[PDB]
């Protein structure tokens, strides 16, 4: 995941289909390997004793001040507008710096994000629409106007900006604990049938 060339945007990210395997728990990030260190939903080390059905390698590029906003049930500038984690999210969110990888000459303006929306996003819901919608309590009614905010914004990924506006590549450990028959487990020894 971290050895890839580049990642996609926050709304049309390139995920990897992960099923019927055991993740590499031999060499991972525990003692603050990257900048972001956040886990939500369940106990942060209850991953090997539990099995997960649908695992997706959701990777997108955000700013420095938006790496802690990806959390289930937590508001933010990109959580309720771009990507909402489901209620059964059992993984963690951890990002590293990519200022010398995703930048270019003049700035990379190919990454965009939605800032405002009419309603909050559902659990496990995504949208790639770039049209103008209702910003907040006052709708724009088509074109941008009537004292409304502009939803569709662009990232200022420039190499001469501050550290808080640097591009950060994220990896979302989308371990979903559902009632479906699970496919991905941990490196543990299961018991027999009693």
């Amino acid at each position, epitope marked *: 995941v971290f050895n890839a060339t580049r990642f996609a945007s926050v709304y049309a990210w390139n995920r990897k289909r992960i099923s019927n395997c055991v993740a590499d728990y031999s060499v991972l990030y525990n003692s603050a390997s990257f900048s972001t260190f956040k886990c939500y939903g369940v106990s942060p*080390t209850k991953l090997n004793d539990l099995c997960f059905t649908n695992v997706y390698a959701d990777s997108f590029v955000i700013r420095g001040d938006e790496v802690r906003q990806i959390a289930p049930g937590q508001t933010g500038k990109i959580a309720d507008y771009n990507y909402k984690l489901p209620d059964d999210f059992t993984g963690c969110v951890i990002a590293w710096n990519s200022n010398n990888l995703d930048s270019k000459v003049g700035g990379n303006y190919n990454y965009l994000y939605r800032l405002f929306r009419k309603s909050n996003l559902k659990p496990f819901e995504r949208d790639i629409s770039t049209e103008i919608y209702q910003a907040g309590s006052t709708p724009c009614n088509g074109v941008e106007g009537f004292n409304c905010y502009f939803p569709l914004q662009s990232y200022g990924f420039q190499p001469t900006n501050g550290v808080g506006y640097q591009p950060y590549r994220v990896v979302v450990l989308s371990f979903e604990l559902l009632h479906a028959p699970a496919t991905v487990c941990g490196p543990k020894k299961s018991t027999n049938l009693v």
Partner: antibody
Amino acid sequence: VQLQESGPSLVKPSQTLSLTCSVTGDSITNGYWNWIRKFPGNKLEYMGYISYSGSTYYSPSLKSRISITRDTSKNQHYLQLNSVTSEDTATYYCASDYHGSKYYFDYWGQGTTLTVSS
Amino acid sequence: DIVMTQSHKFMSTSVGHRVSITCKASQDVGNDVAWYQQKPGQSPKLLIYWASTRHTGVPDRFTGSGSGTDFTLTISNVQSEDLADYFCQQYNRYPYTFGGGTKLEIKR
């Protein structure tokens, strides 16, 4: 390799603190060099590192007041600590990442004492 | 921000017992646990790398293991010269951000 810490010991606040750690033994072609700060009171805060290819990372303890540069032809590493204060008075050290003989090694330098006051 | 949750800053022990220093982190690595050691008045030196070997000048009593949340530094037959600063770090991914810290003392 072996590092040697250096730099001015009298830096006024709200300025730029510069340091110099020279590499002796090999040029900057392979390996990694980091910068650490040793605070009194059983504390050791990590700042960051730089690589030979140009990629660098920063610790999340400082928001936007940490920058590390280097020079390949001079075999020296630099630390640029912006917005210094009286609480940043600590002991500086320089380390180097090295692998060999099926073991990991992290060599240390000499160390210097820098005092920041107005 | 890095949140290194620890029980106590100063841990009390005795000569001949087992030192229990646990870095209660909210993640897991596997078989790559690293520890540091800094004597008072000396330079910080490497103590534990790759959770199976030791550095030059390190005795055989310094070892580290653990799984999941609790990574416990194991020191068997701790002498009076083992009063040093211990920090939690890794050597898998960059940067190598350290931990909180733990200072030892002898309970009398």
